[PDB]
Swiss-Prot record, chain B:
It catalyses: sulfate + ATP + H(+) = adenosine 5'-phosphosulfate + diphosphate; adenosine 5'-phosphosulfate + ATP = 3'-phosphoadenylyl sulfate + ADP + H(+). GO terms for biological process: 3'-phosphoadenosine 5'-phosphosulfate biosynthetic process; hormone metabolic process; sulfate assimilation. Coiled coil: none annotated. It comes from Homo sapiens. In the N-terminal section; belongs to the APS kinase family. Bifunctional enzyme with both ATP sulfurylase and APS kinase activity, which mediates two steps in the sulfate activation pathway. The first step is the transfer of a sulfate group to ATP to yield adenosine 5'-phosphosulfate (APS), and the second step is the transfer of a phosphate group from ATP to APS yielding 3'-phosphoadenylylsulfate/PAPS, the activated sulfate donor used by sulfotransferases. In mammals, PAPS is the sole source of sulfate while APS appears to only be an intermediate in the sulfate-activation pathway. Pathway: Sulfur metabolism; sulfate assimilation. This is Bifunctional 3'-phosphoadenosine 5'-phosphosulfate synthase 2. The chain holds residues 223 to 612 of 614 of the full protein. Expressed in cartilage and adrenal gland.
Amino acid sequence: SDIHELFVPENKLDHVRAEAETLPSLSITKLDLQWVQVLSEGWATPLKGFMREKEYLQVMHFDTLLDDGVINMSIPIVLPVSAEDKTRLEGCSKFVLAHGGRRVAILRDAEFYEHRKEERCSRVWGTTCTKHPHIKMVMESGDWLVGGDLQVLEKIRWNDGLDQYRLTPLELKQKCKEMNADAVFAFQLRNPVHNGHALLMQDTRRRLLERGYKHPVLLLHPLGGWTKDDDVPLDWRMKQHAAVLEEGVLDPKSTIVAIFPSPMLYAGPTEVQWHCRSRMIAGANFYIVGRDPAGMPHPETKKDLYEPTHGGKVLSMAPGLTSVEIIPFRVAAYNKAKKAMDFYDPARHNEFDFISGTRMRKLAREGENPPDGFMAPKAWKVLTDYYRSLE
Amino acid sequence: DIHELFVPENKLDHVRAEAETLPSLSITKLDLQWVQVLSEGWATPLKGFMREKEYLQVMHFDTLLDDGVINMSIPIVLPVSAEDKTRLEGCSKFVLAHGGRRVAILRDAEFYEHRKEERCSRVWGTTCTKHPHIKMVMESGDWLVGGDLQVLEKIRWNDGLDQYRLTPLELKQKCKEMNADAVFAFQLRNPVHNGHALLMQDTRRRLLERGYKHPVLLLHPLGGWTKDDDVPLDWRMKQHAAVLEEGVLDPKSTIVAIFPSPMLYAGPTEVQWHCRSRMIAGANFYIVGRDPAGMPHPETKKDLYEPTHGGKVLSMAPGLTSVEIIPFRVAAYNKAKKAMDFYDPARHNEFDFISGTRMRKLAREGENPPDGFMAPKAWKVLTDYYRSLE
Ligand SMILES: Nc1ncnc2c1ncn2[C@@H]1O[C@H](COP(=O)(O)OS(=O)(=O)O)[C@@H](O)[C@H]1O
Ligand SMILES: Nc1ncnc2c1ncn2[C@@H]1O[C@H](COP(=O)(O)OS(=O)(=O)O)[C@@H](O)[C@H]1O
Ligand SMILES: OC[C@H]1O[C@@H](O)[C@H](O)[C@@H](O)[C@@H]1O
Ligand SMILES: OC[C@H]1O[C@@H](O)[C@H](O)[C@@H](O)[C@@H]1O
Ligand SMILES: [K+]
Ligand SMILES: [K+]
């Protein structure tokens, strides 16, 4: 299957930069720039750039782009612009996008359309609650959206010591080919890997071997774009994942660790389709989904913002995902008798303790060990080190 | 095909008997209008009130998926109080009752959470509780129940308008009787002015010029729940009758019928439902204009929806392959022509826009609208209506 990168070809790049120095310019945020990276590398194939109004409408109402054939696309990738910049750029079909003093892309054949923020947040998140940190960022953005074709001058790098893990979809396909994979199964995650997560990955590996695949390769794919203020930062999460692999909870020989560049929306069953389709583009034939994917507590009511079973049900159902098989799972929890993470069975409610992020964070803050079997000790050590660094 | 949910007349006595002995759930008038919608096949291929899986398909994809892709963009669900859910959750089957009467049996029932904020957000693109239908959803029970619906008999209202409440199959039969070779539908909730008439007349003209010999207009006023300040159904039926009597629309090539669905006022989401239901009734052409199924935002008083979105969305919506969308832009009063005409931007100063507000003013003042805006006998029906409000 095809991957549509948006980079300027290597020969024409001197010419294109020269052109870019002469164009009107538009400042974009760090969030916008992460979306530029997403688009540039082909994760949103077949988009040619930021969404035009027609593509936006298709995504909002149908969770699929339609024009080149039905392919899943459930979140808008759009560029908000202030009314002042919109007026400034009237009649300008092409202009450069800039961040941090650097020109990063040319946007051609621009189309401005009204940023209807309430409707956008309602349809994407199922709420307009301003305490939701990503919704908060949408509401504070400009009153216009600009769609158009994007020519990205070069790969977006962040010079944080992690660029070597920011593999493109083409690079992930090539790496899987070099490992002689006959099945690629992806695990999206935003959190540290505990042994419930590992249980999902090892059970998926087991089932792929039983089907007759000989070299299934795990794509352990932590998300690395914007995340909310309280979460464990990307660099610490990468150290924690490396510790899980060093402990052998996951096998480094059959695993690729890479960073998925998308911002996190925390939009549950809407977002999990984007997490899946982007991995599909990168060549994953199988996609793991568990309970409450891409969810968070409602900031007002503190209840689950989404029904925790909806992500898997929707994803197993979703159109435009024909080259990836969904592997859904139910809740993993701590089995007290086995001293191991296990699949929860209501029929045996008394045998399990559910994993509370709040309680686990309290343990890590105080340096207390979790129950035996919850997380590999060197990875837990990464987390207690992290919380000590904040004092 | 059409999937009606009625008990076969040969098995009715058995089923009625069973219904007499089952636990019972009292439903609202709005619920009963949804029972009518379901029972007659407007939401084919649904077997009843939506189960959670169908609800999720509709909210996220605007299509039902299991028997092939077919457009379905609004939930048709039955809300249930926490108390009634606790009372019935140990029951696989029970009766739906309204006004002391047993109207249906719900079989293989499944209760799931009514997550109201998410439902209203995804269907309407807002949770504004001043929106009157959203208000009704917010005040309903905390559970939804889905299941297979067995409807004992046709839902009749016995108000003197049941003769217009045709089922999809009855609409196909009438079109057969009229020897139609094309059926084009006009959904509406408002009185017919000559802009609406222009959309229908222009559609007829274009079908004639494409070689259709007997195009039949389905003038299909919605007749389920509507908001308080709309013109009531009975007045609208008299107003439409007067439009046909004046010849503005031709009665010999027109079917006037009442579409039983409640009105959501959910704009581009709802217009797909207005379209797919007419597709089920055999319309192969569907007219859509500006701001279909829209309303002013109750809070900000702007348009709740972008007025071009309904036609743009409908024109590319999936699961509508057996109906051709015919979109139109704004029709407004051309002063120089003294007639309704398609609006022209370069030409802006020649167009007069006559809102319901200015019609209220015109009737209050004992005045008529400019010549050409509405057929005189139909405007007269409206002045009777406004007068009846004292
Ligand atoms: N205890 C659990 N049991 C089952 N699945 C889980 C559990 N915790 C997390 N998951 C799943 O594990 C994957 C990653 O979870 P997170 O990193 O927390 O968040 S997510 O945003 O990436 O989804 C998702 O598929 C999610 O549903
Ligand atoms: N002035 C107008 N010009 C063009 N289309 C119109 C106009 N007014 C209404 N419409 C369209 O006429 C049809 C019926 O409109 P209404 O009865 O007002 O409301 S609706 O809810 O049924 O859509 C819809 O297709 C709507 O878009
Ligand atoms: O997920 C990548 C990064 O996004 C940032 O906005 C968050 O503040 C960090 O905690 C996180 O590492
Ligand atoms: O549309 C049918 C009826 O619905 C009711 O809710 C409204 O109050 C009536 O005015 C309307 O005629
Ligand atoms: K602005
Ligand atoms: K309740």
